[PDB]
Amino acid sequence: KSRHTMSMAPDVTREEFSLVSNFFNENFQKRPRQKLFEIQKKMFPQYWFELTQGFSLLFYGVGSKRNFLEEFAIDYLSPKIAYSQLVNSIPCLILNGYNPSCNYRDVFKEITDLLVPAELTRSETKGNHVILQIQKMIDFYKNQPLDIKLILVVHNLDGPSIRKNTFQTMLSFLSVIRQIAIVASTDHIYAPLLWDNMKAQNYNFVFHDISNFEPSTVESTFQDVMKMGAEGAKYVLQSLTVNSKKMYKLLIETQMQNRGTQRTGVELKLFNHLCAADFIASNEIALRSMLREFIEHKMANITKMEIIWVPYTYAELEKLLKTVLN
Amino acid sequence: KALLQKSSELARTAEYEQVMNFLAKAISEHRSDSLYITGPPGTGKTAQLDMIIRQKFQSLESVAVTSINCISLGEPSSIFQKIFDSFQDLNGPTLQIKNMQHLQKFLEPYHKKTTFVVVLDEMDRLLHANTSETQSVRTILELFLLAKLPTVSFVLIGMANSLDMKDRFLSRLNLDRGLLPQTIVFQPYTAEQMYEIVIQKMSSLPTIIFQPMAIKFAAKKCAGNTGDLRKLFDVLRGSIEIYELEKLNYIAKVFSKFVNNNSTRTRIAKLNIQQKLILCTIIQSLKLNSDATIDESFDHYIKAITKTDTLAPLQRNEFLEICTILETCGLVSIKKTKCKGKTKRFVDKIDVDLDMREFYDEMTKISILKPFL
Amino acid sequence: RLSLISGIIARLMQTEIFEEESYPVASLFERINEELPEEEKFSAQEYLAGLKIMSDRNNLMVADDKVWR
Amino acid sequence: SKFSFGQATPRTLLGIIRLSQALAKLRLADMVDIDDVEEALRLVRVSKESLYQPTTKIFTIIKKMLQETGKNTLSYENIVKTVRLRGFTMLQLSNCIQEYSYLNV
Amino acid sequence: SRFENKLKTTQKHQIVETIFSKVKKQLNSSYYLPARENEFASIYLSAYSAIESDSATTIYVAGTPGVGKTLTVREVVKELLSSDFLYVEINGLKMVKPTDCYETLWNKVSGERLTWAASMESLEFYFKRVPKTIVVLLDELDAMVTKSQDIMYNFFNWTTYENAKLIVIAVANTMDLPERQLGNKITSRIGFTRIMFTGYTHEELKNIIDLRLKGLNDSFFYVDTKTGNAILVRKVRLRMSADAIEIASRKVASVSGDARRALKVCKRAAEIAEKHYMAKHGYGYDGVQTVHITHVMKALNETLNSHVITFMTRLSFTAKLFIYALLNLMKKNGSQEQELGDIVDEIKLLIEVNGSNFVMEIAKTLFQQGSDNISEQLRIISWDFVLNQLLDAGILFKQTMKNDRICCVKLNISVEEAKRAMNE
Ligand SMILES: Nc1ncnc2c1ncn2[C@@H]1O[C@H](COP(=O)(O)OP(=O)(O)OP(O)(O)=S)[C@@H](O)[C@H]1O
Ligand SMILES: Nc1ncnc2c1ncn2[C@@H]1O[C@H](COP(=O)(O)OP(=O)(O)OP(O)(O)=S)[C@@H](O)[C@H]1O
């Protein structure tokens, strides 16, 4: 099974990747991107009018929408609605769904403090009373004068914590209230698996496409691939004793004398004698103790001759030869 | 003769010259360079920064710069409590030290507008705390953010053992952000900066403090795997009492404690020829590389001793005592391993520190184990 | 030249004839002119300067001249 | 196994009894002592050994033997030499070798 | 302290101090040492320097239990009271929770009862602020290492402060402990002193016995012939045969080198002669005596020899019927672990494969206790009982399943001795 693999790739370090990535995402398709941004700007009065009807507005589409939501929520809408009702403008409570550390307790503790504490609602705070406390919020809000006092934003609604099911139903009861406007965005292709006709009854979602093919700068940070071990032990050797460099150099030679697999490895006895030959290893214990340091940071393997072999590729070890060992 | 060597056991370093350049704005009251000070362990690095700040505080203008040790927290609140302890004041502490935005209100000084720099000691307890991208990396993320607009900024100086922590940073943070960039490392001083400090730490000099080339010999042949030469002088301070007890001599005394029984003193452990027989009996049971019970070993011990009649078959209770004679010398270890039938039930699996190469030499001299091989 | 003659001393430090990292000066002379390589042995200062290069390579030391630590 | 041959039969026990009777007949005695059986068993075991080419006192004697060189030898030619002049046979000390190996001496 | 006044009572009706009673008084494990003589100095000269110079060091000793490391360091501090310190026995295993030792230290500086949290704050506040003396014994260090090493880092980080008036003394089980459980960052702080304690040797094991037998070996007692009471009518003597004491030494030094094990096997062998002396004359509880070699021959063997072989032949019939079926499956299949229903399948089959013989009086009783009225039992009589009896005995082992057929059974003792004891 001769497969080309990501290990057999010309790799790129940390500062080299992120800088040339920053060059593309700020200079690749710049002119048509704001050219799209001016086209969709005329839809902004249409969103203002429908949002008076308490409609949970939901934005789908390819690409990141994070920049677009923050322009649309903060600068455009939130002072426009305060001027049209008649003083600080309408409070914006974003929810970063790409941040996995969102819970149901903490954000709702913000909500009841963002909303009015007209009564002693801490008396009803008791043991899951969250649905209980919001139910007492809802029926009171059915008989209030209709005006928006809060707009909340939920970025990346299919996020790693917001897509949890006890959190989803929590947002469902918020959306039936007329005083708050719910402007959220998702990115998943299976996002309408999240809602049944029970929740969408509470939601009354409407949909709009926004596809600007954004790079998702902030949304790439928490995500990881093998760019983010061959690269792990690449830094430990840069800070050690000078003898460990030499005893790894003698290790890496005869382990690449023969991918870097088990079969190219060496026996412990002769390697003790080999590192006794260059006046390096005194005995087995002095060898093994500064070999456990290569073991503790998982920089070498052993299987069974008593074969110690390096788990990095054929291409990687000669890169480890000519750069850091030399 | 005691008082010369009673005093033996107790600007100054050539690494302090680096950090004053790295604190080049700390005497002009501006924000200094970006300080993430790491190190391989034992390299003096805990007391290294402690040497700098104590020389900073004894030198230094209103003077208030505090340092706390992150050991017993697991949680980012009470650090911002301990910076309040240099004020000797009173406030509402709990909310202000909890949230990211709550720290920002705390950074408005009172008496004379001297900027503050914090020192985070032993940051690796919080790095190597609870799960990374949930709490601890977020804790790392939140502390290194210095986007504050006045020059009164909480400059971090944190420290760590293992150097994986930089690659653990997110790609936004690695875009030249905060205290990142100057990853000032400290290679372990072989003898060329640490021994000379010992020389100046021999300011009060006795006459016979030994041939110093042997001290140089001590430094050269300890620098294979070491970081603390005063502690490796604390092994000279033990051997200097050896020449008081007798009214690298000791490293020679300590390695023969560790190297032996495989080459020579294996037969010291087995003066009994049956102890030689029972030691080969363990390795013959190791063919089935299983949980090597004291019974499965006793199974192969009987079924071989009925074939070759070298001795009578002995008791299991005798088999219990004889394998413990193999135990106390340090050859074979016994552990109560896992079998999960009814409860966590403990059968005893053994493990041998001998090889067949170091076996075959000591058995060809005795042709009575030669039937057994 | 220098790698081979020290390489004999490696397997001759593998045995306990020096008993420690200490070794006498007569232990050297019974391990150069007694052992296998003939006429490679340099002058009285030169292979005595040759063992300095090993000390400069920090693998073996010279001390208390009747012995060497 | 590999070097084995035959098994123990009751005819061999009867032959051991007959050889002990022949050894007692050669000493012209009316009774069979303990010295004949230990000689006959040694005879029948050394007859096949060429293919490879009452205890406390004995323990005390071994200790006395040790009080000279301190040697734990496996097979004996000069330990047994101080035993036959006393009154005990070659078979009693033969058990004292194996038993005592449990003392690891 | 307080209640030892209340632990005393009055009426003590003249207890008979026999011959071997006064032996066991000094054969108690309580009351300069011969074996670890010079190593006492190696601790003390390491300790005397730091004490009279106001520093902070660490001393690490290891060894198997029974070698005096509980004892020797107590003898270090004991003479030091004659010549500035606060002695604490911070035992590891005597702490219920591992954090509870923190409470003791803050208690043993001023007398306050504070948090393990709140203690170590003020402890850290002590160890870097006080202008200028504390001896602490961190015994049995396997206990306080287990959770996440955050406790063990503290106890050596306090040593690093040059303004810390503390002297720590660690005593472990193994020298390996800061290399197979701790990190290297602790292993830098542990130092490289590493004073090894070996076992005792059998010559010194003679030299430790007579220290207890100082004023009583081959001495004389004053005895009335009526009650068996001895006083340090006859005037008798009691001698100890030193060769039997020697053969006690040559075993215990061989297997363990344990100083409790040497004393206690002499203590066990002492009371064997006690009851045999009381058997022959009967002085109850209200020419020249000795202790034979034959006493320590039994008592040393009494440490070894078992009874599970004697237990098995003294069990019930259906117990021995059970194991004989169980080895039959293990030689049929060679899988050492048989399903429970197959054993019930076998004990049915092991009836009729034997002939029509005693077996019928068995087979009548094996399925009904007489009583031809009630019969036709599927599994045998008391089959739950013997299987429960073999379970709590430790001979058998049966994994937990609600199915009473496919639950596996595993042997727990060696199956050959099970085969061997079955033969009787
Ligand atoms: N160059 C030096 N100058 C002055 N004191 C030194 C020097 N090197 C070592 N020391 C002292 O010897 C000690 C040995 O360092 P350690 O504290 O054991 O290691 P460290 O200081 O904890 O750094 P780590 O292990 O990376 S946290 C230091 O704490 C100082 O007290
Ligand atoms: N050299 C000795 N001289 C006199 N009595 C001794 C000697 N060695 C041990 N003992 C006694 O035997 C007891 C054995 O306890 P220790 O050996 O001190 O404990 P230990 O070796 O630490 O084993 P532990 O505590 O379970 S780790 C001591 O309490 C003394 O009563």
Write up this protein.
- It is classed as replication/dna.
- Keywords: OCCM-deltaC6, REPLICATION-DNA complex.
- The entry is titled "Atomic model of pre-insertion mutant OCCM-DNA complex(ORC-Cdc6-Cdt1-Mcm2-7 with Mcm6 WHD truncation)".
- Chain A: Origin recognition complex subunit 2.
- This is part of a larger assembly, with chains A (326 residues), B (373 residues), C (69 residues), D (105 residues) and E (424 residues).
- Chain A is an alpha/beta fold and 326 residues long.
- Chain A has helices at residues 14-24, 30-39, 44-50, 66-85, 104-114, 121-124, 130-141, 165-175, 197-203, 242-254, 268-277, 284-296, 314-325, and strands at residues 57-60, 92-96, 150-155, 180-185, 206-209, 266-267, 301-303, 307-309.
- Chain A has 2 domains: 29-228, no CATH class; 229-326, no CATH class.
- Chain A has 13 helices and 8 strands.
- In chain A, helix 8 links the parallel strand 3 and strand 4.
- The longest helix of chain B is centred in the first third of the chain and has 15 residues, at 45-59.
- Chain E is an alpha/beta fold and 424 residues long.
- In chain E, 44% of the residues lie in helices and 10% in strands.
- Chain E has a 5-stranded parallel beta sheet with strand order 2-3-4-1-5, sandwiched between helices. Chain E has a 3-stranded antiparallel beta sheet with strand order 7-6-8, with no helix packed on it. Chain E has a 3-stranded antiparallel beta sheet with strand order 9-11-10.
- The chains are: A alpha/beta (326), B mainly alpha (373), C mainly alpha (69), D mainly alpha (105), E alpha/beta (424).
- Chains in contact: A-B, A-C, B-C, B-D, B-E, D-E.
- One phosphothiophosphoric acid-adenylate ester sits between chains B (13, 39, 41-47, 161, 194, 197, 228, 230-231) and E (160, 185, 188-189).
- One phosphothiophosphoric acid-adenylate ester is lined by residues 29-30, 33, 35-36, 65-71, 208, 211, 259-260 of chain E.
Most strands sheet of chain E: 5 strands, parallel
The order of strands across the largest sheet of chain E is 2-3-4-1-5
Strand runs of chain B, count: 6
Strand content of chain B: 5-15%
> What is the end-to-end distance of chain E?
59 Å
Shape of chain B: elongated
Q: Name the structural class of chain E.
A: alpha/beta
What class do helices, strands and sheet pairing of chain B give? mainly alpha
Percentage of β-strand residues of chain E: 5-15%
Main sheet: strand order of chain B: 1-4
Q: Number of helical runs of chain B?
A: 17
**How helix-rich are the residues of chain B, as a percent range?**
25-40%
Helicity range of chain E: 40-55%
How many distinct beta strands of chain E?
Answer: 11
* Biggest chain-to-chain interface with counts: B-E, 45 and 51 residues
Bound compounds: phosphothiophosphoric acid-adenylate ester
Discrete helix count of chain E: 18
Q: Give, in order, the helices and strands of chain E.
A: HHEHEHHEHEHHEHEEEHHHHHEHHHEEH
Distance between the termini of chain B: 61 Å
Protein name (chain C): DNA replication licensing factor MCM3
Family (chain C): Belongs to the MCM family.
Subcellular location (chain C): Nucleus
Subunit structure (chain C): Component of the MCM2-7 complex. The complex forms a toroidal hexameric ring with the proposed subunit order MCM2-MCM6-MCM4-MCM7-MCM3-MCM5; loaded onto DNA, forms a head-head double hexamer. Interacts with CSM1.
